[PDB]
Design a protein around this nucleic acid. Structure first.
Ligand SMILES: [Zn+2]
Ligand SMILES: [Zn+2]
Ligand SMILES: [Zn+2]
Ligand SMILES: [Zn+2]
Lengths: 80, 81
DNA sequence: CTGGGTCAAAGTTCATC
DNA sequence: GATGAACTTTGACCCAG
């Protein structure tokens, strides 16, 4: 079931992931970012629009928005 | 399931934009859609699109991508380099 | 009331022309 | 700039009280 919306990009959501209502895309993205301790950089103004269509344009801005909406790095477990 | 590109007959590398196709036809469809490129056929819009002559008519290669089922809706926005 | 995993099919890269 | 073989990321769908 996906009755709520993603706080980061506005796509559909099953509910909270890492503390925030998010879609499978934003969940996966935050998980991988944290697991591999990735660092991104914005080529524009560090204010890129994050919606379903544009969410992959800028990883840096997608990641800042994950944090801004409440996703917590501590909620990502170690790899099994 | 097929290992032949439905557009040009070269070995396909998997399904791309809805059609079993090669990396060449995938790449060409992606670029055409992303950049809104329009081509013109020099002959009569019926050029042979095969592994060896696929680049000899962009108009006919693109029309064949569409005819074989490639979907423009499956090409996404360009990401940051 | 959300942790985990996969891998098809999206993506980009860059040597070669 | 265009191409295409090789390389990387995404996210829909599945697992589990
Ligand atoms: Zn999202
Ligand atoms: Zn940005
Ligand atoms: Zn082909
Ligand atoms: Zn032609």
């Amino acid at each position: 079931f996906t009755k709520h919306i993603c706080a980061i990009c506005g796509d559909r959501s099953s509910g909270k992931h890492y503390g925030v209502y998010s879609c499978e895309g934003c969940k996966g993205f935050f998980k991988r970012t944290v697991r591999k301790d990735l660092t991104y950089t914005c080529r524009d103004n560090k204010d890129c629009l994050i919606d379903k269509r544009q969410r992959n344009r800028c990883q840096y801005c997608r990641y800042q928005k994950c944090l801004a909406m409440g996703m917590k790095r501590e909620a990502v477990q170690e790899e099994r």
